[PDB]
């Protein structure tokens, strides 16, 4: 019932969600209670193999991966989904015996919905984690901005900018490629503005600093000022980055 979270999942999961409704209308307006619902062992077993596979890979994933929230959260998907099949198999079985079986129809619904749900969660976790990596990056930058307040010479400036400039490009890459992913325009926007807003203080940050580094090395007057047009820049940059972080973490 909510919009699907990114367009990769949407593509995957909507086609199913839809059809599961189609079934539901069907059930509850008179008449799968007409015929036959033919021997369905085969379609199911189809379904079972696929899920068995899915688990295969989830389990593979769990046992690799550094992310311990991943480790915790993915297992139950496996059940939700594993259990779901149980309900499908039974429905099959029930139908093989009695085509007019009414609880089979409920079972079928509820299996599918189960599988949707499992798979949904399963995908939501891997993605939550996929977002968490990005975050780690941003935090990395955030920390470095911190370190601008000690760059005190030409040597260190160059050194400093040698790393900042690229760290930025990596974050930039992924925010952008991340924003194209989302299904909410306001969030897509928010991100991009907040990243463009940063793309562009980068050189301000530079010059801000250059100046501090110039005036410190000239032993003269309004260090005082550079010092603040500089720190502010880090305050905007930072403030914005936490905003990006914020947005990434939304429904």
């Amino acid at each position: 019932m909510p919009v699907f979270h990114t367009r990769t999942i949407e593509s995957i999961l909507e086609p199913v969600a839809q059809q599961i409704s189609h079934l539901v209308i069907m059930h509850e307006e008179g008449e799968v209670d007409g015929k036959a619902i033919p021997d369905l062992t085969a379609p199911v077993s189809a379904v079972q193999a696929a899920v068995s596979n899915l688990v295969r890979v989830g389990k593979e994933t769990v046992q690799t991966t550094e992310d311990q929230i991943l480790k915790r959260d993915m297992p139950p998907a496996f059940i939700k989904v594993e259990n779901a099949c149980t309900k499908l198999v039974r429905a099959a079985q029930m139908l093989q015996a009695d085509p007019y079986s009414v609880p089979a129809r409920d079972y079928l619904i509820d299996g599918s919905r189960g599988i949707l749900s499992g798979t949904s969660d399963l995908l939501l976790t891997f993605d939550e984690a996929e977002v968490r990596k990005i975050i780690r990056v941003c935090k990395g930058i955030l920390e470095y901005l911190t370190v601008a307040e000690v760059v005190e010479t030409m040597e260190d400036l160059v050194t400093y900018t040698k790393n900042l400039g690229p760290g930025m490009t990596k974050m930039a890459k992924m925010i952008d490629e991340r924003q194209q992913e989302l299904t909410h325009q306001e969030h897509r926007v928010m991100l991009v503005n907040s990243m463009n807003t940063v793309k562009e203080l980068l050189p301000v940050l530079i010059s801000a600093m250059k100046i501090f580094v110039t005036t410190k090395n000239t032993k003269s007057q309004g260090i005082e000022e550079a010092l603040k047009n500089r720190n502010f820049t880090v305050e905007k940059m930072s403030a914005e980055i936490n905003e990006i972080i914020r947005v990434l973490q939304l429904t």
Binding site: T8, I9, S11, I12, L13, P15, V16, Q19, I20, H22, L23, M26, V32, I37, P38, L40, P43, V44, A46, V47, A49, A50, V51, N53, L54, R56, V57, G58, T61, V81, L88, L108, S112, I115, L116, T119, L122, L123, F126
Partner: peptide, 23 residues
């Protein structure tokens, strides 16, 4: 990564093909 999604997309058709197949 996309392999995970790879399999989840299958399960979907598994299902759809199934819910199909009742009619």
């Amino acid at each position: 990564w996309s392999v995970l999604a790879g399999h989840s997309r299958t399960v979907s058709d598994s299902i759809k093909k199934l819910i199909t197949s009742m009619r």
